[PDB]
Amino acid sequence: SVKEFLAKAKEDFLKKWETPSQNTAQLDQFDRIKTLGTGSFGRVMLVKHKESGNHYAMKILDKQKVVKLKQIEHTLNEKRILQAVNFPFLVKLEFSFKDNSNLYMVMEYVAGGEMFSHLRRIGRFSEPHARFYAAQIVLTFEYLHSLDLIYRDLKPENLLIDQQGYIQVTDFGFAKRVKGRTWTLCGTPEYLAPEIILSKGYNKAVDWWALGVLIYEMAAGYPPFFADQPIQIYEKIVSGKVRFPSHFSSDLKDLLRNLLQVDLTKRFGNLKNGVNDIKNHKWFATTDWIAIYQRKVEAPFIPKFKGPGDTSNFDDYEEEEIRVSINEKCGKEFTEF
Amino acid sequence: TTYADFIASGRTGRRASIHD
Ligand SMILES: Nc1ncnc2c1ncn2[C@@H]1O[C@H](COP(=O)(O)OP(=O)(O)O)[C@@H](O)[C@H]1O
Ligand SMILES: [Sr+2]
Ligand SMILES: [Sr+2]
Numbered sequence: 001s002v003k004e005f006l007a008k009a010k011e012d013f014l015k016k017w018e019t020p021s022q023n024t025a026q027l028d029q030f031d032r033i034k035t036l037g038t039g040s041f042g043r044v045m046l047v048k049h050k051e052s053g054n055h056y057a058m059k060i061l062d063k064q065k066v067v068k069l070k071q072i073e074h075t076l077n078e079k080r081i082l083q084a085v086n087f088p089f090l091v092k093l094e095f096s097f098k099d100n101s102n103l104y105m106v107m108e109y110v111a112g113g114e115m116f117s118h119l120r121r122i123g124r125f126s127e128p129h130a131r132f133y134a135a136q137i138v139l140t141f142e143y144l145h146s147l148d149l150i151y152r153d154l155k156p157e158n159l160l161i162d163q164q165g166y167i168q169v170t171d172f173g174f175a176k177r178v179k180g181r182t183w184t185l186c187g188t189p190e191y192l193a194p195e196i197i198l199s200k201g202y203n204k205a206v207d208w209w210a211l212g213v214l215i216y217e218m219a220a221g222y223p224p225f226f227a228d229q230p231i232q233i234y235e236k237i238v239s240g241k242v243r244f245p246s247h248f249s250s251d252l253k254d255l256l257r258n259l260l261q262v263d264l265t266k267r268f269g270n271l272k273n274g275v276n277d278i279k280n281h282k283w284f285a286t287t288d289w290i291a292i293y294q295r296k297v298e299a300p301f302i303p304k305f306k307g308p309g310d311t312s313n314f315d316d317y318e319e320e321e322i323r324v325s326i327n328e329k330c331g332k333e334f335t336e337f
Numbered sequence: 338t339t340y341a342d343f344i345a346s347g348r349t350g351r352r353a354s355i356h357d
Contacts (some may be wrong), residue, residue, distance in 0.1 A: 040353065071356065116351060157351050173354065186356045190348070222343035229347075230355065245339070 006146045009086070013147050016084035017177070022337065025049075025095035025106060027324070030058060033309065035317040041066050041075075042102065043320075046109060046311055055309045056094060059105040060322065063098070063330040072333050074186070078172040079105060079337055087143045088295060089136045091160070091168045098337050101325045110168045112161030112303030113313025115218075119156050124221030127249055129300040131284065133159070134215050135292045136167045138284075141211070142275045145204045148179050154210040155188050156217065161313075165299025189230040190223040194262050197234045208269030208278070212259025219252060220245045224260060238262070251283040 030047040037044045042060040049056060066075050082093045082105065095106035112118075115133065119125065125133075137154065144151055152174035160168045174186045181201040193209035195202040216224040224243075225236040240262035244253050258277075261267040268277045279289060291297050303313055343349065 037351075069356075074356070114351075120349065153354060155352065174356075184356070186354065188352050188354050190352060221340060226343055226346060226348060243339070 110160035116156035130218035205270035
């Protein structure tokens with residue numbers, strides 16, 4: 001059962017948490033092909049590993065800049081947690097290493113592209129389609145939270161679609177191991193829970209709020225709280241007034257009312273039955289939770305793939321040459337990486 | 338419509354994170 005599985009998962013996690021993998025490849029073993037996304041501290045590139053011929057996604061982070069912008073702890077969290085977790089809907093870290101200038105995280109290449117792209121392109125997902133992805137997130141948060149992990153950055157741009165049409169969660173940049181409350185103002189404006197914005201101190205219930213936002217956006221085509229600037233979004237979030245599209249089922253609106261609950265003693269995922277309040281909700285009544293975990297459910301959408309290195313499902317980004325300094329930068333800050 | 342107002346807004350593209 002659930003319990004069994006989760007206890008053995010914790011034992012494997014804690015072992016890697018306490019003795020993380022380090023230095024398992026080097027830069028010249030990969031041929032860099034194209035940028036898959038740029039980000040605050042570098043970029044993610046499609047690469048080909050020369051000795052196996054396999055394609056991977058290499059996340060590159062500039063060390064000096066991470067120190068300058070005071071994101072060291074978050075970066076070390078990201079790698080320390082990603083190397084230790086293992087779950088069917090979490091992207092797999094295959095290699096990690098650092099050089100004079102950069103940190104590198106080499107993950108499995110998820111070739112279906114961001115959920116974001118598919119969602120904007122098609123407009124919105126049907127409820128069965130949104131439910132198929134939402135179930136994977138419910139199971140993944142159950143797993144992460146059991147490990148005392150909070151994820152803190154759910155959004156369609158951090159969810160990739162694999163060749164089988166299942167989700168791969170990526171970007172553990174704000175993931176943190178904490179038993180109770182934490183205080184950092186971080187995440188993505190549309191997805192922030194009211195208690196984050198209100199600087200109250202907060203816990204893993206922020207991930208269940210974010211699920212509420214994700215399910216809304218998947219099914220509506222737009223987020224429940226939107227405006228042109230973050231502060232205008234924050235205002236609507238804290239009001240917590242939510243309006244639902246015409247086409248939302250009654251079950252869907254009732255689930256969302258319980259996830260997008262400003263009040264912590266009332267938010268689903270955070271009550272006495274914990275995740276089970278969500279799994280047992282009527283909107284998920286057709287959902288076969290074990291079949292999902294086992295990936296035996298037919299995906300509603302399968303990405304069109306044209307060969308292992310195909311990037312057709314990603315936008316184009318401006319390329320920039322990867323520079324590596326002949327002087328080591330920030331060695332001590334990133335010793336454990 | 339709400340959809341038209343969203344699509345005419347400034348935040349329909351990939352959204353960056355915030356950390357302060
Ligand atoms: N494992 C992956 N496979 C394919 N593409 C990925 C993978 N990891 C990241 N990406 C692409 O790169 C983008 C940015 O990666 P991300 O980890 O979110 O960096 P950042 O935190 O700086 O935004 C993702 O939104 C996705 O488009
Ligand atoms: Sr991201
Ligand atoms: Sr990030």
